[PDB]
Amino acid sequence: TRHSEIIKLENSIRELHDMFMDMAMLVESQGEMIDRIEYNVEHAVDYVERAVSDTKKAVKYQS
């Protein structure tokens, strides 16, 4: 009984820690990816804003 329960608990905690480390690595990768995506989208929105403003002022000057 002692061995059964002790090794069962050891296996449970080991699997818990394994999936937790896997999830932490995945979460770090996700954090890097989302930081990149935020940078990319901020740059894209700034670029499109500048382009549309430039087009508006150009058409106003020409019309």
Binding site: E10, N11, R14, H17, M21, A24, M25, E28, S29, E32
Partner: protein
């Protein structure tokens, strides 16, 4: 199954219509209709014909003025060939990778490097080109500061080298990664595991140096003492002093009672035990 025949006939009719239209300013429409025909074949689930149609559509797109969409079409054609003659898939993925690197997007290039390496090693038995691809991916990722994927590639190549008896590179990679993890507050708990594996690999070179290596690891990382893995390693090291098979066999059985050891770990354990 008449549905497959119907889809094949519809895709062939669409391809014929595309060919007549292109044969009849028309470059853009020709490329678009060819791409639609390739997608129709892909929908029909004819991997060979769909891949051929999509690759000729990619070529015609290259005939059209565009690079980014051209690279997207190259990578999509490589994915389509994935389930076809692997040489064409590999070459098209090389072309897409080169185009992406030329555009400066190194991260996607290294992701495609990993993809090609994995598909090549899983399908074909040769490993050297896959290792080279993984190394190239790690180089780009580290140059771009993508630590996670570069470290994953380094770990993969280290594992392959250890499997290939080139334990020196594997142990060096594991040691550097583990000390870097020690530097960072995060992932340190897992890094010791790498040391354990590395320590096992270390014994493969010789026996007497195992004690010195474990002492160096202990003084470098004192908390590594708490690891039951280190206790098991030292018990087995002491047991190996005598030509007895019962000791280490019972030890590995008891440890396996806790968690199921990886197949590679069992293989290397048997290798060390026998000789």
């Amino acid at each position: 199954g008449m549905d497959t025949s119907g889809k094949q006939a519809e895709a062939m009719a669409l391809l014929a219509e595309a060919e007549r239209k292109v044969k009849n300013s028309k470059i853009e429409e020709a490329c678009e209709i060819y791409a639609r025909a390739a997608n129709m074949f892909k929908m029909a689930k004819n991997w060979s014909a769909a891949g051929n149609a999509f690759c000729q559509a990619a070529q015609l797109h290259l005939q059209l003025q565009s690079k980014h969409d051209a690279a997207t079409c190259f990578v999509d054609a490589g994915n389509a060939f994935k389930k076809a003659d692997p040489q064409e898939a590999i070459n098209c993925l090389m072309r897409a990778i080169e185009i992406y690197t030329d555009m400066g997007r190194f991260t996607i290039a290294a992701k495609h490097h990993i993809s090609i390496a994995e598909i090549y090693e899983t399908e074909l038995v040769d490993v050297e080109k896959a290792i080279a691809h993984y190394e190239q991916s790690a180089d780009y990722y580290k140059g771009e500061e993508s630590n996670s994927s570069a470290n994953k590639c380094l770990l993969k190549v280290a594992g392959y080298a250890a499997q290939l008896e080139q334990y020196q590179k594997a142990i060096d990679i594991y040691e550097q990664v583990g000390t870097s993890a020690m530097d960072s507050p995060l992932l340190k708990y897992s890094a010791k595991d790498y040391f354990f594996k590395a320590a096992l690999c270390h014994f493969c070179i010789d026996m007497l140096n195992a004690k010195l290596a474990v002492q160096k690891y202990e003084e470098l990382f004192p908390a590594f003492s708490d690891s039951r893995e280190c206790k098991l390693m030292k018990k087995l090291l002491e047991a190996h002093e005598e030509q007895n098979v019962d000791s280490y066999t019972e030890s590995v059985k008891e440890y396996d009672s806790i968690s199921r050891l990886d197949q590679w770990l069992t293989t290397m354990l048997l290798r060390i035990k026998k000789t």
